Nucleic acid binder design. Structure first.
Ligand SMILES: Nc1ncnc2c1ncn2[C@H]1C[C@H](O)[C@@H](COP(=O)(O)NP(=O)(O)OP(=O)(O)O)O1
Ligand SMILES: [Mg+2]
Ligand SMILES: [Mg+2]
Length: 418
DNA sequence: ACTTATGACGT
DNA sequence: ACGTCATG
């Protein structure tokens, strides 16, 4: 019934903003965004504080536009090195967080600001230690129970406590429900440890799988955690849009909506697994049939380290690189940042990348990557990497350079122990 | 002219 | 191996 494991998803609240606000006290408790490349339209927003969201400011907005919605908006710029954005500060901030999470349980780095946790084992330990002890409300100061309260509240904290009381009073409530509660107690502790040790606040979702735990985390932001039990799923999914569920945000979800003629996740229950398979594939049908019943089996991978390391730049419109000299210069600029990142990787993580991937895009092409080619990554030399990368894409030139290049991408892959 | 990184799947 | 999809 997918009530076998306890899985959590922890996600930092407006991460890049918190990172800047910690370092610059002035930006704290104020409408705040983080931008990059100020020259064109004040730059592009990649992170918005909650105060700034009250005014309607969103990521992928122009800073000049954001200022129109929010006159008093404070802006922080991404560091620029070698003529491109540099995310080093946010990656180091990430490492602090990932390290604190590691002490509690085994984690899967899902993004720079979020990881999954498997609390299944930890829950078992706590119960033996905690055996015969009731769970106090004090143990869950920031926990929301989805679907509660019900029955017999005007303030949001009042609703939270009321729901928490009903759930705790029942714990009536099964063995898998008790495990989620202990799972959540542990998440309270882990979240408190993050803020105390780094100054960063965050939200969390606690459930039986990664899809639900991720959905749960969203429900109460920021600085709150949410438990989505097995029993809540039917009511929660019933009015829940398909696009909301992870991996249904793009084309597949659209085709499910278009083919099946439904709009909510719950509506999938009526169809047989075979029906779903025939429409959307064997792998997807099977996945859909279980997910709408709240059952998901993807494992929490024990991976704290990124599989791959890469850098890229985009040369939109006029700025597009139409000469051999420019292509050579930016590969070198990219290869140089890559070398710094790669060297650090070896010292911290005892591993080396064996392959190098070059991806490029050209004018008139929609696709993120027009093409990609690879070659051997034998040495961490920016000049060699840049020179080799030129060699594997040099043919690409139809011609000077034609067509001019929209983007350059260099990626390191295939790391091995050492 | 929403950029810059990531991971997984299909074939 | 190379393209594509999905996500942050
Ligand atoms: N499309 C994008 N392009 C570039 N950088 C991005 C990005 N999306 C996110 N980032 C960077 C900047 C972001 O701060 C960060 C975290 O990812 P989120 O969790 O998706 N968003 P946040 O933590 O800001 O807040 P909250 O979760 O509470 O809504 O990654
Ligand atoms: Mg976040
Ligand atoms: Mg996130």
């Amino acid at each position: 019934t997918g009530q076998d494991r306890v899985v959590a998803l922890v996600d930092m609240d407006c991460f890049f903003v918190q990172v800047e606000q910690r370092q610059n006290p002035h930006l704290r408790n104020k409408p705040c965004a983080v931008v990059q490349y100020k020259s064109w339209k004040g730059g592009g927003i990649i992170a918005v504080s909650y105060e700034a969201r009250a005014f309607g400011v969103t990521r992928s907005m122009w800073a000049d536009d954001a200022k129109k919605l929010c006159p008093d908006l404070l802006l922080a710029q991404v560091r620029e090195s070698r003529g491109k954005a540099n995310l080093t500060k946010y990656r180091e901030a990430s490492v602090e967080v990932m390290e604190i999470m590691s002490r509690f349980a085994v984690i899967e780095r899902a993004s720079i600001d979020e990881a999954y946790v498997d609390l299944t084992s930890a829950v078992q330990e706590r119960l033996q230690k905690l055996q015969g002890q009731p769970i106090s409300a004090d143990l869950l100061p920031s926990t929301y129970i989805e679907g509660l309260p019900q029955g017999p509240t005007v303030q949001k904290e009042g609703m939270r406590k009321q729901g928490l009381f009903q759930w705790l009073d029942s714990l009536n409530l099964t063995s898998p429900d008790l495990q989620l509660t202990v799972g959540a107690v542990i998440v309270e502790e882990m979240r408190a440890a993050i803020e105390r040790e780094t100054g960063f606040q965050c939200s969390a979702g606690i459930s039986h799988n990664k899809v639900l735990a991720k959905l749960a985390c969203g429900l109460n932001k920021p600085n709150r955690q949410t438990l989505v039990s097995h029993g809540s799923v039917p009511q929660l999914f019933s009015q829940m849009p398909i696009r909301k569920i992870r991996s249904l945000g793009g084309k597949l979800g659209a085709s499910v909506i278009e083919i099946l003629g439904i709009e909510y996740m719950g509506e999938l229950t009526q169809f047989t697994e075979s029906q779903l398979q025939s429409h959307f594939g064997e792998k997807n049908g099977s996945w859909l049939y279980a997910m709408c019943r709240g059952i998901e089996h993807d494992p929490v991978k024990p991976r704290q380290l990124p599989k791959t390391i890469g850098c890229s730049k985009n040369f939109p419109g006029k700025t597009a690189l139409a000469t051999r000299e420019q292509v050579q210069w930016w590969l070198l600029q990219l290869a140089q940042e890559l070398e710094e990142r790669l060297t650090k990787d070896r010292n911290d993580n005892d591993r080396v990348a064996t392959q190098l991937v070059v991806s490029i895009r050209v004018q008139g092409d929609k696709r993120l990557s027009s093409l990609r080619r690879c070659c051997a990554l034998t040495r961490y030399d920016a000049h060699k990497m840049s020179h080799d990368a030129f060699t594997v894409i040099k043919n690409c030139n139809t011609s000077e350079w034609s067509p001019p290049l929209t983007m350059l991408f260099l990626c390191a892959t295939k790391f091995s122990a050492s």
